[PDB]
Write a protein that binds this ligand. Structure first.
Ligand SMILES: [Mg+2]
Ligand SMILES: [Mg+2]
Ligand SMILES: [Mg+2]
Ligand SMILES: [Mg+2]
Ligand SMILES: [Zn+2]
Ligand SMILES: [Zn+2]
Ligand SMILES: [Zn+2]
Lengths: 38, 34, 55, 285, 149, 107
RNA sequence: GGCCUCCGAACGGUAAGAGCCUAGCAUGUAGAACUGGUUACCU
RNA sequence: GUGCUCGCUUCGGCAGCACAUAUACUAAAAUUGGAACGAUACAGAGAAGAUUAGCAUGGCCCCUGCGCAAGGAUGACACAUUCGUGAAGCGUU
């Protein structure tokens, strides 16, 4: 029998979220010079 | 992981959406117009 | 989400001008293929702007 | 919703009341908040509660509270000594955070029921650990902690005291120290090492008393069995040379083309094989 | 040795990471880091470096060549094979990848494999020179019928 | 999901907790079910006595001294009545030894 | 015929740091072992 | 535990029945390892020769701040001479 635990309404945010971790990394294929121009 | 922080700006304002009326220029008129 | 402001406006306008030119032209000018004069073209930009300030 | 659990934790009662907190605790490994579950396992029991988030269990395939494998009930260092160490996972700080993040997306995209890459490996087993795997539930594990007033001689709650009144474990024993992180990663785990020492003594694989000998000295035959049991067991291995049979002491000698096959039949056989509902015991010469 | 060597690695390693974090791209930092770990024969680390560099800029063809090359130098044939396949899949237009891929297979002896690669390559309707190379490939063996086809 | 009448759940949970035998819940155990799931020593003997239903027989009450008038002071015990009956040395030693060892280890 | 304002607080100044040494602060954890086996034939 | 069985039936005991139905991060503990901007010590502010005003840009750096405001040193962090190998591909004598 699952029961949801009662939360104390005057309880502050329990734990700290601020921590920051670098953005995660397949490329679709692209399918898309003269000397003088260079 | 959603923070309990808030801000003044964020609070409700203009919760209603002003739909255009018939004389304002509802899309119904527009479709019919030449 | 920092908000544009009086302290930051001149810096803001020049920031997004450097970006405007950069995106536009390096997406516009190219075929250097390696790096095309981005530092350099922008230095030409600041040079020209000073020159117009000095008439 | 709903934890991942050992059968041994969950309880010996089939009826169970189990409570739930949305973000109860940080997990002691990937250190995130996660849904936590408490329940009472039994009459004298302790109210266990999940210790680690569901993800890092799916990652190493383990109970949330125990951190023992689902199938084997073995500490992780063991079943890795049993198959594949090369799973790994960064221990180090911001990596751990990063790798957890990505692997959390990878898991999100799975069928849901599968411990990621390990399961591709997890099927092939039975080398030893099956034979060292634990058989029945072990309830001594959920008993309440040792009352620490009484263990100083004082406890003034008398009989009421829910804790347990008895002698604790001598801090000398290396099996005491037992960090959590440590048990998780499979480093210098005293328990796991003990089980490794226990693994070695299994009389089993060294064999090779003499060269080329494929002779199998089979004890504990019994007079119900026929040879045809033997052959239709042993044709899997290869080309038999022959089989000698003695029913007066109920020992059966066997001979195969190569010694390799005889070693095999030992391995596959030793203290494992039974046919005719009767144990078929094997020895060399 | 045992500890003294180790400290050296931290100073270099840490420096490499700092350089990368500062500039993010400028893949000469990525490459140098990869090369150093390759030289110490820590090639599992090297692989991760190359993959991270690819995440930053997958289009950079020097990066891919250095990556595949590293695998080949360490006799890691199947890794190299994977990598080549990826390179041609994501950047099909780069002819350098195709030329190297077929060359590698030829060196390994896998004529069939090389043929398969070239047949893939030809689907892109490439350049006169590519077709010549395919024909010449065939003509290093008798295979005149194939050439004519 | 399941939607079992709460009251029945309580009946089964207490029945098991107290006596060890409760009728098992399963759906596809045989695809038909005839069987109890408890230790069952109690179940054969106690005929599935429910906690709510009165027990057929009563045994072994233990007494706690009480004064309920409340006229007296200090005197009065209410339902706060401390069981009259309930107020090892051999062990008393092993534990101590263990403690000592632990202390030493801290050193 | 009348007509009477205001009223105060915050930072922007005492360095920025790196190091070493020493209270302080959170956890109230999870887990703690294991047995029983035979030889027999022709030159 | 309370009440009731024209309960056995005395006022003691016993029986039946009704009512009443699962608390609790159990510890009044034990252990276990990051921070004080303390003193001390060394050293000592970006931009050009110096002295300084500042807005910014970027984020595995934060702090103060209710704040999408503003501050924290601009918060810190940001270090002209002259060519040839080796391999591969393509066309040619
Ligand atoms: Mg200032
Ligand atoms: Mg100033
Ligand atoms: Mg500022
Ligand atoms: Mg700044
Ligand atoms: Zn975790
Ligand atoms: Zn568990
Ligand atoms: Zn106690």
């Amino acid at each position: 029998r699952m029961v949801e635990m009662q939360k104390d309404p005057m309880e502050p945010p329990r734990f700290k979220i601020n921590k920051k971790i670098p953005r995660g990394p397949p490329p679709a294929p692209v399918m898309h010079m003269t000397v003088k121009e260079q | 992981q959603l923070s309990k922080q808030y801000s003044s700006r964020d609070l409700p304002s203009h919760t209603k959406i002003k739909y255009r009326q018939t004389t304002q220029d509802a899309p119904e008129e527009v479709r019919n117009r030449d | 989400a920092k908000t544009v402001t009086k302290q930051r406006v001149e810096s803001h306008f020049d920031l997004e001008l450097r970006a405007a030119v950069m995106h536009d032209i390096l997406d516009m000018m190219p075929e250097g293929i390696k790096q095309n004069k981005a530092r350099t073209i922008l230095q030409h930009l600041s040079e020209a702007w000073r020159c117009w300030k000095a008439n | 919703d709903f934890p991942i659990l050992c059968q041994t934790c969950l309880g010996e009662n089939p009826y169970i009341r189990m409570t739930k907190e949305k973000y109860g605790k940080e997990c002691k490994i990937c250190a995130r908040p996660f849904t936590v579950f408490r329940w009472c396992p039994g009459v004298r029991m302790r109210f266990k509660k999940t210790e680690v988030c569901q993800t890092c269990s799916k990652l190493k395939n383990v109970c949330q509270t125990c951190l023992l494998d689902l199938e084997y009930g073995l500490p992780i260092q063991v079943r890795d000594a049993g198959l594949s160490f090369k799973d790994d996972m960064p221990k180090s700080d911001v990596n751990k955070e990063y790798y957890t993040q990505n692997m959390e997306r990878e898991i999100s995209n799975s069928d849901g029921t599968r411990p990621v890459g390990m399961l591709g490996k997890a099927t092939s087993t039975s080398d030893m650990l099956l034979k060292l795997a634990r058989t029945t539930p072990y309830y001594k594990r959920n008993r309440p902690h040792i009352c620490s007033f009484w263990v100083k001689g004082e406890c003034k709650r008398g009989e009421e005291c829910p804790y347990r009144h008895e002698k604790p474990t001598d801090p000398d024993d290396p099996l005491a120290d037992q960090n959590i992180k440590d048990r998780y990663y499979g480093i210098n785990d005293p328990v796991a090492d003990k089980l490794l020492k226990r693994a070695s003594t299994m009389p089993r694989l060294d064999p090779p008393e003499d060269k080329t000998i494929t002779t199998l000295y089979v004890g504990g035959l019994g007079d119900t069995i026929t040879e045809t049991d033997l052959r239709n067991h042993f044709y899997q291995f290869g080309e038999i040379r022959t089989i000698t049979v003695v029913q007066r002491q109920q020992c059966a000698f066997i001979q195969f083309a190569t010694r390799q096959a005889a070693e095999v039949a030992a391995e596959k056989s030793f203290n494992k094989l039974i046919v005719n509902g009767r144990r078929l015991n094997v020895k060399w010469g | 040795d045992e500890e003294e060597l180790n400290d050296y690695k931290l100073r270099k390693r840490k420096t490499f990471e700092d350089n990368i974090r500062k500039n993010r791209t400028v893949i000469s930092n990525w490459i140098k880091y990869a090369q150093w770990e390759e030289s110490l024969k820590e090639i599992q680390r090297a692989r991760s470096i190359y993959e991270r560099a690819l995440d930053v800029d997958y289009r950079n063809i020097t990066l891919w060549l250095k990556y595949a090359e590293m695998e080949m130098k360490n006799r890691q044939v199947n890794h190299a094979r994977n990598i080549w396949d990826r390179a041609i899949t994501t950047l099909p237009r780069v002819n350098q990848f195709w030329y190297k891929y077929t060359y590698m297979e030829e060196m390994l002896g896998n004529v069939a494999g090389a043929r398969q690669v070239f047949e893939r390559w030809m689907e892109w309707q490439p350049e006169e020179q590519a077709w010549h190379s395919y024909i010449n490939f065939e003509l290093r063996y008798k295979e005149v019928d194939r050439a004519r086809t | 999901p399941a939607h079992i009448n709460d009251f029945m759940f309580e009946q089964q949970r207490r029945t098991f907790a107290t006596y060890g035998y409760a009728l098992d819940p399963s759906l596809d155990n045989h695809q038909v079910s005839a069987k109890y799931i408890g230790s069952v020593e109690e179940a054969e003997k106690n005929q599935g006595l429910t906690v709510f239903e009165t027990g057929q027989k009563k045994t072994e009450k233990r007494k706690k001294f009480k004064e309920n008038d409340a006229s007296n002071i200090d005197g009065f015990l209410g339902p706060w009545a401390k069981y009259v009956d309930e107020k090892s040395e051999e062990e008393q030693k092993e534990l101590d030894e263990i403690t000592a060892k632990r202390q030493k280890k801290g050193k």
